[PDB]
Every structure is written in C-alpha cells, then in structure tokens.
Design an enzyme around this catalytic site. Structure first.
Site, PDB file in Angstrom:
ATOM      1  N   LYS A  53      34.035 -27.500  26.728  1.00 16.52           N
ATOM      2  CA  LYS A  53      33.823 -27.238  28.142  1.00 16.52           C
ATOM      3  C   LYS A  53      33.136 -28.405  28.835  1.00 16.52           C
ATOM      4  O   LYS A  53      33.322 -28.593  30.040  1.00 16.52           O
ATOM      5  CB  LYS A  53      33.038 -25.937  28.300  1.00 16.52           C
ATOM      6  N   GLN A  97      26.477 -19.144  25.946  1.00 18.93           N
ATOM      7  CA  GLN A  97      27.336 -19.182  24.741  1.00 18.93           C
ATOM      8  C   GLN A  97      27.034 -17.983  23.844  1.00 18.93           C
ATOM      9  O   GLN A  97      25.882 -17.735  23.572  1.00 18.93           O
ATOM     10  CB  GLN A  97      27.180 -20.515  24.011  1.00 18.93           C
ATOM     11  N   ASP A 120      32.433 -17.223  33.473  1.00 19.00           N
ATOM     12  CA  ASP A 120      33.113 -16.643  32.319  1.00 19.00           C
ATOM     13  C   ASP A 120      33.652 -15.245  32.594  1.00 19.00           C
ATOM     14  O   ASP A 120      34.439 -14.739  31.787  1.00 19.00           O
ATOM     15  CB  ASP A 120      32.167 -16.546  31.117  1.00 19.00           C
TER      16      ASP A 120
END
Lengths: 285, 285
Positions: A53, A97, A120
């Site tokens: 990313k 994460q 996300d």
C-alpha cells in the site's frame, strides 16, 4: 476466443485518472491526499501488505504515513492513536493493519475509526451502509471486483451470479453490491459455502461466478456453463501464485475471465487508492 | 399432513418466558424494562404501528413511553430527543417511527441512536455487525422468522433457502442470518427479485422459501417442491389480510408453513419485546 478481465490494464487507467485529479488539485494550490497506516507487531505477511500500500501511494501521488507499534501496545494507546488520526486534518484516510494482538479488541479499535476516514471500509457502519444502500466506503476487494465488471460493461441485469464463499472480505460484500439495482447489479445471487452440497450443479447455472474459496483448481471446466464470466479471487502459493480456477480448461469456456495474477489483485490495491482520493475530497462514492 | 409454523403459539411461549425473567428481576428489587417511542406527525398507519408496540409492552410487563412531535419539528430538536433518550438510564431501548418528514435526514436521526438501545436494529452499525457476525441488535422481523425455525428445530444445514425479495426490512437480513454457521443457518442462499427471470424454476429447487415480495398469491403450488418449508412474510389487505402464498394449494405440499395471519406477524412484535429485555440487561444476543 475468451477475453481477459485485465486487472493490470484497468488498474493502470484508474491510477492515471487519480493522478489527473491530484495534479488538477495541486495546480489550484492544494496538498496531495494522505493515507496513514497503523501497524502493530512484526508479522511478515502484514508487513508486505503495508509495503504494497506504500508503493501504491507513490504511483498515484499520495503522501503516506506509517506508525509502527510493538505488539505489547495497550488498547488505550492504540485507541488514542485512532482518535489522533481521526482528528488530524492532514490525514484524509487511514487503515489499521489486521490482525491485532489477542489482548486488543479489534472490534473496539475499528469502531473507533471515523467512518469518513475508513478507506478500508472495515467499520461496521460502512458495512451496514453498504447493505442498506447508503453512501459509505466500500471495502477495496469487492469494490475492485465490481469496477472490473463496470469497466467492461458486462451485462449483469437479470443474470445469475454464483458466489463461492461467504467471507466478510469478499463473498458477502460482492453479493450485496451485485444485488443492488441497476448495472452492475440486479443479479440473482446464490451464495455457496462448505455446507453447499451441490456446488457443481449450482455453478452450471451461473452467468457469473465469483470464486473466492481459496482452494487451488476448485473450479473446473465441467462446472462452467459456456459463455460464463469468471472472477478468480483466490490467492494461493503452490509448487507459483494461482487462483481458485483451473484456468487452462475453464478459460476457453468463458466470455470473460480474470487471470491470476494480473486480475483482482491490482484492482484491490487501486480501489484502496480511489477510496483515499474520495476521502480527501470528503466523499464516500 | 402439513404442519403449521404457529406464530401465535410460539409468540405466546416467548411472552411467558419474558414475564418470568421480569418477575424474577422484580423479586430481587429491580424495575421493569422500559421501551420509549418517538412519533412525528399523525400518519394513521405509523399510529397503528406504535399502538401495536404499546399493547405488546403491556402483555410482557414493560414500561412504555411515547413522545409525539408535530411534523414541523426540526432536525435539531429531534436529534436532541435522540441524545436525551440515549442518556436516560430509565430507558432501556427506544425506537423512532419511520418514515419521518421530507426535511428530516432519517439516516442522521437513526445513526444518532446509541446502538446499545437500538432495539429495532435499524442503526447501520447493527446492520453491519449482523453481516460481519458481531453482537448487535437483529431487527425484529428477520429475528422472529429465524426464531420460528429454531423453535421447530427445522433442519437448515445444507438446505437451499430461496429468498423472494431483497428488501432491507426482510430479504437482506434473513439471508444474512441463514448464511451464518450452525443451525439455524448454513443454508445455501438464493435471493430473487423483480429482475430474476426464472423465479418458478428457482423456487422448485428450494428446501426453504421466504416469500417477502408483498404480492398476493405470488407463490403457487407449481412452484413448490414437496416437503418445502414456506415462510410467508407478505401482509396485503385484499377484498382480508393475506400473504404472498396461495395457501390453499401450497400448504398441502409443505412440511411446514406459516399462516397469514398468525405466522410472522406475532413473531415480529414479540421479537421487538425480546430485544428490549436484552437491552435492559445490557445484552445484544
């Protein structure tokens, strides 16, 4: 005779579209969008996931932040980090994460994220907005699958879409997107999983198959109706990275099919980039 | 030869179970659970909907509140009412009657509700928690449909559940519940709607049919496989209140079938009561 659903190619064109919007924003005196990431521990997998990313932010022209905690960080300091990022006007979106250490309540951490920065789309409020049909961030993997179909103007209305897998990351959200009105969407949806006793029979009625079980060569040619559109979401390293589809015998039967690699993978990454650009412009799309 | 899915009867037994928990709570010196309702305008339909929920609170032994605004109430005063109810420790759960006036942002109002008191399960965060598999309030209508199946120990694992309708109130949440692992659940789900071209063909493969289209006698005997379980969620007043199922010819083919009335209707009301009891005990179930 079959056509590729070319993720590498489509990804490239979206990256170029993002650069143009950012270049335009820069010309009128603005700052580049910023994606922040939170990492806890030194898991090698998650480490590569974050690195990927970071590279993507480079190519589209985004600023990127990364905070690294040790895996003994407290729930209280992690929540404070989430609140700080929520309140930092230089951060347009951010991601935490997963997975997190056993002592941290992942649900608490994620639900502390402001939905406006949840690029996300992991916040349960965005998951719920998606189901209801309200604006909110769509998570990256289903977002990119649906964009792949939109970009090739794949007919979907009135088509039978068979989803192999009921995962939160792919099966459930892709089903919800393709059940929406209009195109892409208006599919009749069948969701299959480990307790589905007749998966072959079901797949033989599919106009579109979303293969997201994570089992190499699960989908074989005797399961696929000629003309089918096949999206391969599997990502398994075998003695080479392959998907769930036995490409050699399935692809000749398809109107359209994603390769692995070069299919869903690049669309997922670039869809995260698009959500970040939308967040920077105060949008959910 | 067919068996009723007797909503009146099952409702009765749940009401009795709720009274026992409340009586027990009263004996150890506690207060009865409290359901508050917010009404705006004088719509006759919504008025009957609220009245029905008042009567139910009586029978299970709940305190009930009802606030009535005129339909020129501002978004700001309605939001203040939501925050007051959130913060009132004498109110265990509350509901905002929909729809609201055009000038009010329903999404804003509902999302201002604390999820811990959202006993209708209308908050997008509870809708999202349901999809993901996290604790949260399940909305009353799908909750009661799934309880009807649990109460009769209906086999569901590995069964094909055909859902007629993609509504937010029923089709989507019931699909999500019956896609969960374990029983009731582990169904293979097919969701059908107005663009499904072969609904009869699909229904002929169903072990369970959830008929939630709102069209009288939509489901006929030539669409139903012998032994099927049929849940009739329709509620249409015709020249008599009927469901979506042509009961006369369909019911003889079924192992189990809900009547209309006396089926889903009472389960919906009593499921709201159960969510309120859970809220009073700080639970989501």
């Amino acid at each position: 005779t079959y056509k590729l659903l070319d993720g590498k190619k489509i990804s490239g064109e979206i990256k170029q579209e993002i650069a143009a919007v950012v270049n335009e924003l820069l010309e009128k005196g603005g700052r580049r969008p910023h994606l922040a990431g939170v990492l806890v521990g030194h898991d090698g997998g998650s480490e590569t996931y974050m690195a990927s990313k970071v590279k993507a932010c480079e190519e589209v022209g985004f600023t990127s932040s990364l905070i690294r905690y040790e895996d003994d960080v407290t729930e209280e300091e992690l929540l404070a980090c989430v609140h700080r990022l929520n309140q930092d006007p230089t951060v347009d979106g951010f991601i935490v994460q997963l997975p997190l250490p056993k002592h941290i309540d992942e649900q608490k951490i994620i639900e502390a994220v402001d939905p406006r920065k949840d690029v996300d789309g992991f916040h349960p409020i965005n998951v719920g907005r998606l189901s209801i049909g309200l604006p909110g961030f769509v998570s990256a993997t289903p977002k990119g699958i649906v964009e792949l179909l939109r970009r090739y103007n794949i007919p979907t209305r009135g088509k039978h879409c068979v989803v192999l897998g009921r995962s939160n990351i792919v099966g459930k959200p892709v089903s919800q997107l393709l059940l929406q009105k209009g195109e892409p969407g208006d599919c009749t949806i069948t969701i299959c999983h480990s307790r589905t006793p007749n998966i072959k029979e079901v797949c033989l009625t599919a106009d579109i198959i979303i293969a997201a079980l994570g089992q190499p060569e699960f989908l074989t040619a005797d399961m696929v109706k000629p003309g089918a559109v096949v999206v391969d979401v599997g990502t398994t390293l075998v003695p080479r990275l392959t998907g769930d589809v036995k490409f050699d015998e399935v692809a000749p039967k398809c109107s359209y099919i994603t390769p692995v690699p070069g299919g869903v993978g690049p669309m997922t990454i670039v869809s995260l980039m698009s959500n970040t650009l939308l967040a920077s412009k105060g949008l959910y799309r």
